[PDB]
From a paper:
To this aim, a small library of 24 variants of SvS-A2 was rationally designed, based on the SvS-A2 crystal structure targeting the active site as well as surrounding residues. The variants could be grouped into four categories based on their substrate preference in a Malachite Green assay: promiscuous (I), inactive (II), diterpene-specific (III), or sesquiterpene-specific (IV). One representative variant of each group was subjected to crystal structure analysis, and Cα rmsd values in the range of 0.35–0.68 Å compared to the parental SvS-A2 structure indicated that none of the variants had significant conformational rearrangements. Therefore, the altered substrate preferences are likely the consequence of steric and/or electronic interactions with substrates, intermediates and/or products, as discussed for the individual variants below. Furthermore, the studied variants were dimeric in the crystal structure and maintained a substantially elevated melting temperature similar to that of SvS-A2. The Gly83Leu substitution may shield off not only Phe79, but also Phe82 and Phe84 from the substrate, which are putatively relevant for cation stabilization. Since our modeling data suggest that Phe84, which is conserved in bacterial sesquiterpene cyclases, is involved in stabilizing cations for both the sesquiterpene and diterpene reactions, sterically blocking this residue by the Gly83Leu exchange results in a near inactive protein.
Residue numbers in the entry:
A (entry chain B): 8 to 86, 96 to 231, 240 to 310, 325 to 358
B (entry chain A): 7 to 231, 240 to 309, 325 to 357
Amino acid sequence: LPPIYCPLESAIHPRVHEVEKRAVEWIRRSGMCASEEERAWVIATHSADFFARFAPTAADEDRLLATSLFVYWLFAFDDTRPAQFNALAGRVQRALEAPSAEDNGDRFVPALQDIARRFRSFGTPTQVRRFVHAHRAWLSGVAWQIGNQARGHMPGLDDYLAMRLLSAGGEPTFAMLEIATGAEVPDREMHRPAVRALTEMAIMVAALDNDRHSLTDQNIYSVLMHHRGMSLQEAVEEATKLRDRILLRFLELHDRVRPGAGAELSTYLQGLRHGIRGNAEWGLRVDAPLTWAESPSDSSPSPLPGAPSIAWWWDDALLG
Amino acid sequence: DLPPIYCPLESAIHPRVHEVEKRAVEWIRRSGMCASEEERAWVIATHSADFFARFAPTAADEDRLLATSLFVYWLFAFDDHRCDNGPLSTRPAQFNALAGRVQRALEAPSAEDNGDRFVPALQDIARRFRSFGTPTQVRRFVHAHRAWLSGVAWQIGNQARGHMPGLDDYLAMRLLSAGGEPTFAMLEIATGAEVPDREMHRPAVRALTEMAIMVAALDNDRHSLTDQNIYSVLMHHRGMSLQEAVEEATKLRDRILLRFLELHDRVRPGAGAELSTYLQGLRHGIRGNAEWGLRDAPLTWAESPSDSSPSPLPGAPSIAWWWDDALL
């Protein structure tokens, strides 16, 4: 119901329409889609538009295209029993890490191995490893989500946020920023806990803005209605306060970290911000005047009570 | 009828192994990881300090060898109570949630246990790793850890279904499920020798690491001799007798160790000091895994490999890139 708090930079790659054209071509020739109907559904995600908002100045069009292809792949992959899914997650992950892996008629594997080949031609082995690890973390979150559903386990807030941090696909999406820009972030800066907390907070906000398409009954609203005995409206109210409070922490930690940051880490952080805005904006649009909340619905500087898995995001002692 | 192991690698053990084992035994008693005295004695009897003292035998800091040794105890204990034997060993849906809760606890110190006695123990190990490892080395460990849990989740999925994976899926799965990724990723932590990203992530070093892990895994399948292991896989998929499968298994394991030795000899000369140390660790680890498996008494080793082919293994495309030098 209420308008989104997002005081972050909005921009989109100027060559977005050219990337999109090539991406529609790759989707058609990729084998990942059985019928015309399924290819139109994938094309209709507008994933080139989505990702062009994450890396709006990427110098290499090919880089943007490759990264964009994976966002199309991820929406096509998302669209299985836990036991089979755990095997499928293992095979798909192996194919990403081993080019000699063979498809065995699985329609997703050749397409991901084509994305991986492209990533290997542009990115350092280091950047490829970051993407590989982010990819496994997303697959873990999806395995967790499919598990809860098969059992009829509605997770509490803490488990839901931990799981949705992985299952929403934000880890692999944000790990593509460097591959798209070419700006290699040194280990010493990338793995600073402060930078990990910023990455996870960007991911968590994009995930909660995606949930907002209550229009998978494992979502923040279901979780709060089931565990707090709230109505839908009391839960939309409570979800917005949680989310706004996370993005308020992100802006605060970002302003403490940005000043000292080198060129490559600065580009990456601008990416986090472009991606949070891009994610909210793309969700609302998929050129109408959009209204944005000028102010957060909850301004508390404190950790979320009930969510101890994310409280370290607020512990400055632990982030230095 | 069990042929001796081909392992012409350096066997060595930390001179302070007994001092570290004593501290390890006391941590175990205080950890809360063990419900009963029978469990404490089971975990102590793994001799995991002996095990990892063979992986990092010149570790300058005893506290680093202790912390990495604790995770080896933890791993045996978590494998035996939550992965291999209890209600979760055929309940992938419940395991996927545990894998998620444990992995999150490793990455987030503010995480709460929720009635899990394995979690506070892991968090203590994690606190140790963050006290003296770099954030980079901690992330290398965290990522290796999730990789191992994904293998176990795959394995448990296969078990619930009574699905016997083919050779390709079994080697892919077992590369993860046998716990070699997070075991080998603790070398740097024990040792203190931080390997730069550009060296660590080199396809050649990744392949040497996978090969080290795959030999240790198949040495572990041998040590344990329906069940998903190399022997049941070859018996089911090639219609072999146990005896033919034991011989086929030794052959393919020996082929992988030969490629590892061959790639090692090409990479080692140019390696800087930290990558050299890491490499030595892979070698010490393969041998130490095999040797700890067979235990005072004289051990017999095979002098020659049972198969000397220099090409990729038939029926396992997922590992063929270990032999592709243009890619490495």
